[PDB]
Every structure is written in C-alpha cells, then in structure tokens.
RNA sequence: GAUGGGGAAGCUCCGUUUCAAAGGCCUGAUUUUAUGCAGGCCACCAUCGAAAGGGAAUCCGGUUAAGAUUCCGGAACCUGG
RNA sequence: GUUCUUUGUAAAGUGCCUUCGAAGAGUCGAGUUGUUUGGGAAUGCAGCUCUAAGUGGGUGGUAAAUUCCAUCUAAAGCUAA
RNA sequence: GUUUGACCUCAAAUCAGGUAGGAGUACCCGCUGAACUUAAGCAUAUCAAUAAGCGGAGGAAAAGAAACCAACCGGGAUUGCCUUAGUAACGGCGAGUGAAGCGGCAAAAGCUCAAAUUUGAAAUCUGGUACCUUCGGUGCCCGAGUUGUAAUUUGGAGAGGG
C-alpha cells in the first residue's frame, strides 16, 4: 500500500542521505542494560494515576473537614518530571538531575537542541530509544522526555 | 521551554540541519497527495502563535499548489483586443498563492472554518503550506468563548473573502497614506469618491 | 354532520381504526352512489371525516412518541423544532453566555456603575 | 421479467454453507458455534445437496439461513464483542504496567446472562422440565471428573453445588420413584409435577480423560444446562416456599460433604414410595457407597448414619445396619443386618420385601430391574 | 422463525433406558443375550478384518 | 461519462484502469494459553448507449359503433421454484 | 417591589523598594517583471532570486552617504453605533 | 523471545453524534475582466481599475482599536457628510484623470492569544450511561491532551520577592 512504500522510501532516504552531526546523534542510544536500569529506577517514581489522585483528594478533604494543617498533611510528592516545556524549564535553573530524550520524536527539530542545551548547562542527559517506553511510565501515550528533580534519600 | 528554540531554528533555513530536513519533508510531501491531512503540525510553535490549540475540534491540512504566473484562459493566446495586452503568460495572479491554498483546503473542508496558514516547504514546481482549521460544530469550540467566535455565520469561508491574514495583505488593508486607495476597501472608496452627492439644498 | 375531533380524542386507537374503516366503506359506497346520481353533495363530508380521523390517529401516535422520548437527548428529528435552518446553527444561549474567567473577573471588578450629573 | 439465474432461489437461498454463515456473522466461528449451542440452531441436511451447494457433492453443512438471521439480533453477540474489546483493553493495561488499572477494568465488567435465552427457548416451564434429563446428566458427569486444564475447577464446583441442591430438593420432596444400579452408574428416576425425569449418577471414582472429545462444546452445553437447571430449581423452590439458595452448615461440608449439606427449610406423602422405611434408622458399613445410598434412604424419609462420620466425629436408635464385608464382625443380636441391594428392590417395588432375603453372604437376585 | 421449532434430524438410535445386561450381576438370560449380541457385532468386524 | 487521481482563482477541464488498501470463495476443537480468527485460492472494473444490432416462449376460430397474436372457445410453447 | 441562599478560609483593585519586562521569519527589506494609483523614482497588489537584527524594525510624499531627532511596534485575533 | 504489547502512520464501517452543496444575490468581501465612445484615423491615456463571468455571509458587510496622522502649545478605534478640492499631483503635461492631514458634525468600548515550570499534584476537555430543577447540572465509564488542555500578562502595560 502506498503509505507503506512511502514510509519505507522515507527510511531508505534517511539512511542513504548524508546527515549533519546535530542530527543522527540519535540512534547512539543508551545500551539496553543501562536503559533497563534507568527504567527500573524511573518506575518507582511514576506519576500518580487519576484514581490515586482522587483518593488523595478525598483524604485531604476528610482531613480539612476535621483535622488541621490544610493541604500539608500529605507527604511531599515524588514523581518524574515529563513535560517537554517543563523539562526545558527545569534546565538552566537548575533543579533537574537527569534528562532522558526519546530518539524517535516525529518532529526531529523539537529535540535536536536538547542535548546541546544540556551540554551547555551541564545537566546529565541520555537518549533512550523509544518515546513509547518513556510514556509508559508517564501514564501517557508519549512523553518524549523524562527527568527527576527530586528523589528519596 | 522550546518556544524560542524552535522559533530561532526555523529562521535558520539555510543551516545544514534545516537544509536536510526541508528536503526530506518536501520529498515526503511530493510522495503524498496534493491535499492531505497532516496528523500533527511540523512547526508546533508557528501554529501556537497562530492561535491553534492542541485540543479536539482543531485540524491541520497540508496542501500543495503549483508555482507560476497565471495563464490567460483564451485559445492560442489570442488577444481579441488591443496589442497592449502584453505577456499573456505574464499575469501575476493578484491573489497570493497562499490564499489559493487556503481556498483549496477550505473547499476540501468546507464544514471547517479556515483561520490561518504558514509556510512549511516549497519546491520549484510547488509551494507547500499547512493551513490550520477548526470545526464550529464541536462543543469544545462553541464553549470556551475565546474560540467560539468562529461559530458566527459571518465568519463562514473567511478565506474566500480575504479575511485571512494573507487575504488582508493581498487586499492592502493597512493604516497609512500609502494604503489610501485600499485603506477601507478599494471598491468601497472608489464608489464613495465617485458618488455625486446632491443635497436637497444644493451647496 | 361529520365526526367531531374532540369526540375522537376519547376513543381508543382500535376504536379510531374501526371508525376509519367504517368511514372508508361509506366513502366507497358513496363513490358508486355519485356515478349512480346526478350529484352527491354528501360525499364531501365523509372524506373530510376520514382526514379528521387520520389526523387524530397521527396526533395520538405523535404524543405517544413524545411521551416515550420525553426526558432524554436525541429526540426524533421530526419532533425537533422547525424555527429555521439558520437558528439551529446559532449558538445555544448557554454557549453565547460563555465567558473566560479573565473577562469574568474584569466584569466583576468594575461593573458598569450607575451615575448621573446633577450635583 | 427475465431469466431468474437458477442458483439464486430454492435450496440455494434456504440453505447456505457454514463458512458463509461465519462470514456473514464475522464472529470467527467460535462465538458462532457457542450461540448455536445456546440458540438451539442445528445442522440440517438438504433433500437435494446439488441445489443447496450449487451442484457440489461435498458434505457442506447448512444451518437454515433464516435461523442465522434471527441469530444476528441476539444481544449475546454484542456482549461477546464487548468482551473482545475488554480483552484488548486488559492487554493494554497489562503491557503499560498499570496493574491497578487492570484491576479497575476487571471490576467494571459483568458476565453475559443466558436467562433471556432460557425464557425464549423454553416456554411452559414443564416443557423445560421435559429437557431436564440432559442437564442433570451432564452436570452429574462434569461434577465427578477430576479438575483439569480448561476447567479451572470452578465449573466443577458450581456443578457439584447444583447437584447437591437438586438432590436435597428431591430428598425433601421424596420425588424418587425408581432406581437401577449399572456398571456405568446408578440410574435414577423421579416425578416432577407428574412428569418423569430419568437421570444417571456416575460412580465417585477417578476416570481418565480421552482428550479426543471437543471439550469446549461440552463446556458450553454445561453452561446452558446449568442456567436451565438453575432457573428450574429456583421455580421449584419458590413453588414449595423453601428459601433459595438453601443455607448450608460449613462444618457439615468439612465432614463428608454429603447430602446433609444445604439443609432445606420453609420461608401428605406420596403413599407408598414416599415415607418408605418410616421411623427406621439405618446404619451402613464403610465399604458400601455413602452418597448413592444415603440419598435414597433420605428421600424415603428414613434416618441414616455412617461409620465414615466416626472417623472424625451414637448408634442408640439404629434399626438396621447395611453391610457388605465377606465376613461381617459379630453382629448385635438385637440389630437387623441386610445387604445394600435390599433398598434398591424395595424402592423399585415399594412392597417392603422381607428382610430374610439379601442377608449376607447369600447371593442377591440379579437385578429384577424395573425396565 | 418457525424453523427453530422443529427437532434436529434423527441419527443413529439412542435410548435413555439402560440395557438390562448392565444391571449389577445381571440375570443370566438377558446377560447372555447381550453378550451374544455384542459378540456377533464384534465377530462381524473380525471376519471383515480377516 | 463518475469513481482513485492530476489541472484550473473559479464556473469547471483531463482521463475510464491511470502511480488506488477497487471483496468473494473454501477449511476448522487450527491444539494446547481455554470468552481474542487461524490457515489457503482468485483477480478488471461503475454506469448509460439501437423500440431496424443478438434475444426464451402462441397458433387458429369467433367478437365491438370503435380493441386484440392482447377480449371468449380450442389447442400451444419459454423461465424460476 | 419583595423572595432562598450565600461567595466572604474564595476572587478583584490601589502605594513604596527590589530583580525582572520573553512581544509573531520564506517574514520585513531589497533586485527584476506584470498590473494599478495623483503618488511623481516606482502608492498598493502580485510572479521568480537573495534574505537578516533586536538600545532593533517601519514611517517622516525627491533618489544616496554621514551626525540626529518626532511617532508607533507589522509579519496572530474578536468586537454593536 | 521463531511470542506479545506499546508508540506512529494509514484504511474499512448503511458505526454513535455532526457539517457543505442549492436558490436569492439591490448593498458588501475578493478573483478574473474587454471593447464601443473620447484624444486625427491610435498601439501609452480615456471608457475602467467599469460591463459580463466566478467564489463567500449578513441585515447590513468590510474595517476597526495604529509598525496612525503630523512637525505643531502636537492630536489618538473604525465608519459617513460639509469643507480641504476640482487644489497638491498624474497624464504623446493633450484629451482628461485626480487624492490625503488638520477643522465642524452623526455615532463612541473595549480589548483577546503566542511568547512564563502549577510541578505540592492536567487543576482542562469531547463522547456514552443513570438521575434531575433539560438552550443545561451531578456521579460513573471510555477517550483527546504532557509535541501542552485551565488561571496567571498583551506593552496602555506587565511578572517572582519584601
């Protein structure tokens, strides 16, 4: 089907044509062992699911209805940062400790500057293969990025 | 965030990175149909500054249109008139080609109301564009008063009337003495200045 | 002289169907009587009574369909309002009344004051 | 008009290939076979295979196309499609790692109910009793086989529960009228509002599974028969006023798990077959079966006690003691003793044949079978 | 549809009633009769195989 | 002369299979994952277009103020089930 | 005119000090050609080429360079009279 | 693991819920667009940036709150009339064409996004279901959305901190 041949010729053109160095830094992905370790670490700090968020909302509402210290009784949150604009904003502050970058973002231009800005600010970063793997821990179809501003001791 | 980074990277069209991405994109579009719905915009910052949200009821339509001077639709190039009709192939098609692409995407998506469009690519035989669109019928647009203005019947087919910013540029609508011929519509000012007012008590 | 619609309204649907069949038989007999007679003015009445019984049965079925469909979205299109095609595309009053929170705060902060200039 | 294109009407229209039915239903033939087992549709043989098959001699099945058209409206097909979508949703929840979302999805679903099929298929409830014989047979068969793959044993538990409930109802109502022991099992018969209902009870012994049979169709037939017998037992309990499902003492299930479980209670006797052995308190040796025999003496109204109950834990009122050992231990002079067979002929006849017969070790009459 | 009401077409005969020869020490008459009938049914196939 | 497409600001032009994902047949417990279709074959194009082109079938007798191989009597032939 | 309730732990406004103040790119602009304007050194629109910066850019009706000043912030958008 | 799922894209739906065709067309918003006539018979110019043809909504439409007008003691959304003015200005400087600031009057409204980390909680929203006080509201369930949905700011200003 014409879309199949179109995507195949697009991949063949991406392979055959010469590429500027700023592109093709993707596909030098982190090794599967360190990537699996990074995902095993990130899995502990997945963003709260909406059901757990509603449960925490009911808990804080029951606390305010009778207890004191409104909105303070809950423990400090601990979840990976994932918003692309939020992730770029965490850099150059600089609260970010790490910045994952998907290699397969559909607009290649959206993330080509991320490694360079990370090298400029010195924040650690790596290009894990697959945006979908970054999104599975995010509770979203795709996130294209991940970061950890804070972590348990 | 990425706003200014992409906004500056788009300006470096001559850079080898954009230089190669534009060729890959023009090839991928040439393989595709002259009119097709892009799944997502290739320049999110441009649509974001053109008023597009990323929410239901918004739509994007990649489009393609042939470059070149308008050809007069007469057999054999016959003048059937005074010689002064120089350059039968030289007609410049007063309306901008982007307005033609907007009219085409609106004819394909006439239920949708065209809002804005932006250059994404071009070749020797074509000038690509990615007109954005919104559906008035969607409840998300009818609510959120900021985007509900399109639902008004007067806003129908804004591209056909030139109300689109490319159409407002082709119309010459701008303040200043330079635009006095079309500061408020060329035909309107022409009919107004040509009017022979005659009060019941002649002046 | 002919059926009265208010009398028909009380009748059960089977009773209206029987009255319709009887009026149809009377019309079929009067159609032969008209060719058997120089003129049959009476035929004009039964044909109007048939249309009246048909309109009564139609109003009964329509009110029944309005009752079963009452209180739920997507009523049948024939029951939908027939103001004009343009008004159906017009924004609903809840939609025209929509306002962003910024404009709402700007209105709540400085509502148009009442005043007069005398002293 | 114009030439009617012979292969367009007649048997060609009334009959259709089963693959054509699976294509028209687009249900992958599995839900189709299941609905056919549920809707009662059965294969049919055209009188002229050449017409139904466009002249092909192949033994193509045909299913009365109009019956498949009636099957198209069945809600259960929509419920099966909803379960098919739910399976993909569970696969997505499991592959995304959000197990809590998978639990929330599993909580937000319900199994399809066949009760509407039970109503449309069996009007005139006694007509539903007419087909009950297959249901009790399939249930008593599935209850006895050891749990194995493709069973999960939950179906075996529901079958054992429905069987214990039907047996407790037959005992409380004393509906038993005939018995016939056989190498394949202990056959049974009992009236149901005057309708006869034969059924077989497999012996409680391990049995090999040939595995050559199509177990899935047997499971679907068991589910249909289970829903049917459940509605039948509910109607039979409401007619008698007994609470349903009957309550059971869990401690009794832990002892022998016999008929004593699921005691019946409200919210003359058939004379003679009912209240047989009245006021008698039978005892039974371990070697004789306890379930097949205790159910008969209880349906006759006689009291029963078993030595197997003594393994975990009075005999102060026993009037009889069944025994089958080759050399019985010295009997009490005041207690009667008889072989198990004596109950069977007494139920087959009801005349209360003299106890001097069937005394061990004397040979029993072969069967004197009622049929 | 009326087609559902009719029973499925009959196939090889079957009966709910158990044969008298499977009756827990069956009487010698019916027992020997069933043994002779099954022996003939087996001997037919045995002769065809031979 | 549509459709898939390619032109034209546009009323609309080209083209009829051309750079289209252009449905209709068989098997079945598809054997182990137990309530998820698995396995095989194929093949070009819509539609309109002749009352003198091809076509599946009726002959006689009688009858009206005006109809008939069409109406009545008789004897026929073709298609589908 | 009266009538139930609040929202009042929520939302908005005003002064001082402090560090900030992102604001639209195949766009503007210029070369060539067609059209048009009173616009005349080329008012506006349009085809092809080149194509950037932010104490920056446009305008200041005579084309250029040099030192300045007067007024706004285009390449996004809604709005009755 | 010679298996599955996820992401991205693309198809089928007589799928659930929607929208456009057309007519009218005096006025409006744009495209395309001639000559007759007048200047000698004219190819610049006039007819005309008109007639005809084409696309798009309304009761008005467009435009509209300046990359404005002005050089002054400077005015300050758009639009219509008087005047500016038959003037500046254009035109084989010939025919002829030909505007705009200021002034008076009619009517006066403001402003909205992108460009901000909420990150102590995507707080946003389309759709189905049940109920009700039905141009909508509530609970629940799918989905869009992290390549960005709400509030916070549109330069007149404006934002973190005290």
Angle of the D30-39 helix axis to the D65-72 helix axis, nearest 10: 100
Total number of domains constituting chain B: 1
**How many residues make up chain C in this entry?**
119
Provide the 3-class DSSP secondary structure of residue B133.
strand
Closest nucleotide to residue D79 (Cα to C1')? F35
Cα–Cα separations (whole angstroms), residue A113 to A117, A128, A149, B111? 6, 16, 20, 39
- Chain B interface includes A14 (CB < 8 A): yes
In the structure, how far is the CA atom of residue B164 from the C1' atom of nucleotide H123, in angstroms? 35
**Per the omega criterion (within 30 degrees of 0), is the bond before C31 cis?**
no
CA–CA separation, D343 and D353 (whole Å)? 9
Six-digit token string for D242: 């007994």
Distance B197 CA to H86 C1' (A): 15
Distance in Å from G72's C1' to C103's CA comes to 27
Answer yes or no: do B17 and A6 touch at CB < 8 A.
no
d(CA B100, CA B97): 5
What is the domain count for chain C?
2
Chains that touch C (3 or more CB pairs under 8 A): B
- Residue B128's H or E segment, with its range, is strand B127-134
Handedness of CA D71, D73, D76, D78 (dihedral sign): positive
> Chain centroid to CA D224: how far?
10
Nearest chain C residue to B139 by CA: give it.
Answer: C95
Place of tokens 């320049």: B43
CA dist D209 to A125, B134, D135, D142, D256, Å? 60, 65, 20, 11, 26
Domain extent at residue B154: 1-203
**Residue A73 near residue A60, CB atoms below 8 Å:** yes
Report how far residue A16's alpha carbon sits from residue B20's, in angstroms, rounded to the nearest whole number. 12
The phi, psi pair for A55, rounded to 5°, reads: -65, -45
Rounded to 5 degrees, φ, ψ at B30 are: -65, -35
Record the tokens describing residue A44, joined without a space. Answer: 């502990």
Which nucleotide lies nearest residue D107, CA to C1'? Answer: H141
| Whether residues C84 and C110 fall in one domain | yes
- Alpha carbons A101 and A113: distance in angstroms, whole number: 11
Rounded, the Å distance between the CA of B177 and C1' of G62 is 17
D92 close contact with A: CB closer than 8 A = no
| Half-sphere exposure (Cβ direction) of E47: Cα atoms closer than 13 Å | 6
The tally of CA atoms less than 13 A away on the side-chain side of residue C93 is: 0
A124: which residues sit within 8 A by CB, 6+ positions away?
A97, A98, A99, A118
Q: Are C66 and C78 within one domain?
A: no
CA distance D256 to chain E (A): 26
Q: Which residues have a C–N gap over 2.5 Å right after them in chain E? A: none
Nucleotides of H under 7 A from a protein CB: 4-10, 17-20, 27-35, 42-45, 49-50, 55-59, 61-70, 78-83, 98-100, 111-130, 132, 134-137, 140-154
Whether residue C68 sits in one domain with residue C83? no
CB A115 within 8 A of CB A103: no
Q: CA-to-CA distance for B4 and D266, rounded, in angstroms?
A: 82
Q: Residues 117..146 of A with a Cβ closer than 8 Å to D: which? A: 136-137, 139
Q: Say whether both C54 and C95 belong to one domain.
A: no
Q: Any atom of strand F under 7 A from CB of D18?
A: yes
In SS3 terms, chain D reads as CCCCCCCCCCHHHHCCEHHHHHHHHCCCCHHHHHHHHHHCCCCECCCCHHHHCCCCCCCCCECCHHHHHHHHCCHHHHHHHHHHHHHHHHHHHHHCCCHHHHHHHHHCCCCCCCHHHHHHHCCCHHHHHHCHHHHHHHHHHHHHCCCCCCCCCHHHHHHHHHHHHHHHHHHHHCCEEEEEEECCEEEEEEEECCEEEEEEECCCCCCCCCCCCCHHHHHHHHHHHHHHHHHHHHHHHHHHCECCCCCCCHHHHCCCCCCCCCCCCECCCCCCCCCCCCCCEEEECCCCCCHHHHHHHHHCCCEEEEHHHHHCCCCCCCCEEECCCCCCCCCCCCCEEECCHHHHHHHHHCCCCCCCCCCCCCCCCCCCCCC
Six-digit token string for A22: 């700023």
Other Cβ atoms less than 10 A from the Cβ of B19: the count is 12
Rg of the Cα atoms in chain A: 19
Please give the Cα distance from E19 to E38 (Å, whole number): 12
Q: Is A87 exposed, middle or buried (0-12, 13-18, 19+ CB in 10 A)?
A: buried
- Give the whole-angstrom CA distance, residue A73 versus residue A63: 8
Q: Which residues contact D203 (CB under 8 A, 6 or more apart)?
A: D144, D185, D186, D289
Cα gap B191→B134, rounded to integer Å: 36
Between the alpha carbon of residue A78 and those of residues A36, A37, A42, A72, A73, the distances in Å are 20, 19, 11, 15, 15
Kindly state whether C103 is in contact with chain B, defined as any CB-CB distance less than 8 angstroms: yes
Q: Provide CATH code, domain A1-153.
A: 3.30.1330.30
> What would the two tokens of residue A4 be?
């199949």
Do C67 and C89 belong together in one domain? no
D11 chain-E contacts, CB cut-off 8 A: none
Contact residues, chain D, for A136 at CB < 8 Å: 96-97
Of the candidates A17, A106, A109, the beta carbon closest to that of B9 is on A109
> Around B101, how many Cα atoms within 13 Å sit in the side-chain half-sphere?
30
Contact D366 E8 (CB under 8 A): no
Instruction: Answer yes or no: do C48 and C95 share one domain.
Output: no
CA separation (Å) from D193 to D73, D196, E29?
Answer: 35, 8, 36
Chain D contact present for A153, CB below 8 A: no
- Do E and D share at least 3 CB pairs under 8 Å? yes
- The dihedral over CA atoms of C1, C5, C10, C16, expressed in degrees to the nearest 10, equals 80
Q: How far is B188 from chain A (nearest CA, A)?
A: 46
On whether the CB atoms of residues D284 and D304 are closer than 8 A, the answer is yes
For B143, which residue in chain C has the nearest alpha carbon? C95
Pairing mode of beta strands D185-192, D195-201: antiparallel
- Tokens 């005939």, residue located: D178
Q: Determine if strand F comes within 7 Å of the CB of D343.
A: no
Question: Residue C50 sits in which domain range?
Answer: 1-73
What the block records as the tokens of D1 is: 């008009």
Q: Which residues contact residue D7 at a Cβ distance below 8 angstroms, ignoring those fewer than 6 apart?
A: D54
Q: Would you list the domain boundaries of chain A?
A: 1-153
Beta carbons within 8 Å of C33's beta carbon, 6+ residues apart: C40, C43
Neighbours of A96 (CB within 10 A): 22
Contact A85 B2 (CB under 8 A): yes
| CA separation for the pair D17, D32 (Å, rounded) | 13
Please indicate, yes or no, whether residues C5 and C48 belong to a single structural domain of this protein: yes
Do chain A and chain D touch with ≥3 beta carbon pairs under 8 Å? yes
- How distant is the Cα of C54 from the closest Cα of chain B, in angstroms? 39
Whole-number Å distance between alpha carbons of B41 and B6 = 13
The phi and psi torsions of D85 (rounded to 5 degrees) equal -70, -35
Helix (H), strand (E) at residue E40: helix E28-49
Going by C-alpha positions, the residue among A119, C27, D71, D196 that lies closest to residue E4 is D71
CB B35 within 8 A of CB B63: yes
Q: What is the CATH number of the domain that holds B105?
A: 3.40.1120.10
Structure tokens at D231: 């509605």
Do C63 and C92 fall within a single domain?
no
Q: Are residues C21 and C40 in the same domain?
A: yes
B190 nearest nucleotide via C1' and CA:
H49
Compute CA D125 distance to the chain's CA centroid, rounded to the nearest angstrom.
Answer: 17
């Amino acid at each position: 089907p014409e879309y199949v041949r179109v995507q195949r010729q697009k991949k063949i053109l991406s392979i055959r044509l010469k590429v500027p160095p700023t592109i093709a830094q993707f596909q030098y992905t982190l090794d599967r062992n360190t990537a699996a370790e990074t995902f095993k670490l990130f899995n502990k700090y997945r963003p709260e699911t909406a059901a757990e968020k509603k449960e925490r909302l009911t808990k804080e509402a029951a606390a305010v209805a009778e207890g004191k210290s409104k909105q303070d009784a809950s423990p400090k949150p601990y979840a990976v940062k994932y918003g692309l604009n939020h992730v770029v904003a965490l850099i150059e502050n600089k609260k970010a400790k790490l910045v994952l970058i998907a290699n397969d973002v559909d607009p290649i231009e959206l993330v080509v500057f991320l490694p360079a800005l990370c090298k400029k600010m010195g924040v650690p970063y790596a290009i894990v293969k697959g945006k979908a793997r970054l999104g599975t821990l995010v509770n979203q179809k795709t996130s294209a990025v991940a970061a950890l501003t804070e972590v348990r001791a | 965030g990425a706003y200014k980074y992409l906004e500056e990277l788009q300006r470096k069209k001559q850079s080898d990175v954009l230089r190669f991405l534009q060729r890959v994109r023009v090839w991928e579009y040439r393989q595709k149909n002259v009119i097709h719905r892009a799944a997502r915009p290739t320049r999110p910052d441009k649509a974001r500054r053109l008023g597009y949200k990323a929410k239901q009821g918004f739509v994007i339509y990649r489009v393609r249109v042939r470059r070149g001077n308008r050809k007069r639709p007469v057999p054999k190039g016959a003048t059937y008139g005074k010689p002064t009709n120089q350059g039968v192939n030289e007609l410049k098609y007063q309306r901008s080609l982007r307005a033609t692409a907007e009219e085409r995407v609106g004819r394909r998506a006439a239920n949708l109301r065209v809002l804005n469009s932006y250059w994404v690519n071009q070749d020797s035989t074509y000038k690509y564009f990615e007109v954005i669109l919104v559906d008035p019928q969607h409840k998300a647009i009818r609510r959120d008063a900021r985007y509900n203005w399109i639902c008004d019947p007067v806003h129908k087919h804004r591209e056909a009337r030139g109300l689109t910013a490319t159409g407002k540029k082709s119309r010459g609508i701008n303040k200043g003495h330079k635009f006095n011929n079309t500061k408020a519509g060329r035909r309107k000012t022409w009919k107004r200045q040509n009017t022979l007012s005659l009060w019941r008590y002649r002046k | 002289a002919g059926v009265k619609a208010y009398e028909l309204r009380t009748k059960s649907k089977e009773q209206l169907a029987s009255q319709l069949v009887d009026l149809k038989k009377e019309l079929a007999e009067l159609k032969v009587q008209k060719l058997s007679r120089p003129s049959l003015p009476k035929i004009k009445t039964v044909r109007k009574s048939i249309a009246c019984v048909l309109t009564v049965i139609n109003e009964q079925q329509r009110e029944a369909v309005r009752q079963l469909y009452k209180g739920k979205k997507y009523q049948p299109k024939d029951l939908r309002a027939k103001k004009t095609r343009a008004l159906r595309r017009a924004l609903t009053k809840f939609e025209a009344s929509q306002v962003t929170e910024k404009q709402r705060k700007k209105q709540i902060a400085f509502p148009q004051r009442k005043y007069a200039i005398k002293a | 008009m114009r030439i009617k294109k012979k292969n367009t009407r007649g048997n060609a229209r009334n009959f259709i290939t089963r693959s054509q039915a699976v294509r028209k239903l687009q249900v992958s033939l599995a839900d189709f076979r299941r609905l056919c087992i549920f809707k009662g549709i059965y294969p049919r043989e055209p009188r002229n295979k050449k017409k139904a098959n466009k002249g092909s001699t192949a033994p193509t099945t045909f299913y009365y196309a109009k019956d498949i058209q009636y099957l198209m409206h069945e809600p259960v097909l929509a419920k099966f499609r909803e379960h098919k979508t739910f399976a993909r949703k569970l696969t997505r929840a499991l592959g995304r790692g959000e197990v809590s979302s998978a639990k929330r999805l599993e909580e937000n679903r319900d199994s399809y109910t066949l009760d509407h099929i039970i109503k449309e298929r069996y009007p005139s409830f006694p007509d539903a009793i007419r087909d009950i014989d297959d249901a009790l047979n399939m249930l008593f068969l599935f209850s006895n086989l050891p749990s194995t793959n493709q069973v999960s044993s939950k179906i075996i538990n529901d079958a054992q529960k429905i069987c214990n409930q039907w047996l407790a109802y037959v005992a409380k109502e004393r509906l038993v009228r005939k018995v016939f022991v056989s190498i394949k099992g202990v056959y049974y018969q009992a009236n149901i509002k005057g309708e006869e209902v034969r059924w077989l009870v497999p012996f409680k012994f391990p049995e090999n599974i040939p595995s050559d049979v199509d177990f899935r169709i047997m499971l679907t037939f068991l589910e249909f028969y289970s829903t049917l017998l459940h509605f039948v037992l509910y109607k039979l309990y409401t007619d008698s006023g007994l609470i349903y499902p009957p309550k059971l003492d869990l401690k009794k299930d832990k002892i022998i798990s016999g008929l004593s479980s699921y005691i019946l209670e409200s919210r003359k006797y058939d004379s003679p077959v009912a209240s047989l052995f009245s006021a008698f308190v039978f005892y039974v040796s371990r070697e004789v079966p306890i379930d097949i025999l205790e159910f008969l003496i209880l349906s006759c109204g006689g009291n029963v006690i078993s030595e197997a109950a003594m393994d975990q834990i009075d005999m102060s009122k026993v009037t009889h003691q069944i025994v089958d050992r080759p050399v019985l231990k010295n009997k009490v002079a005041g207690r009667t003793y008889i072989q198990p067979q004596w109950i069977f002929d007494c139920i087959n006849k009801g005349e209360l044949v003299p106890a001097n017969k069937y005394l061990p070790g004397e040979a029993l009459p072969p069967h004197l079978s009622p049929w | 549809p009326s087609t559902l009401d009719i029973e499925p077409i009959a196939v090889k005969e079957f009966t709910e009633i158990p044969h008298a020869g499977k009756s827990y020490n069956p009487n010698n008459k019916a027992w020997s009769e069933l043994i002779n009938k099954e022996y003939k049914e087996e001997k037919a196939r045995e002769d065809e195989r031979i």
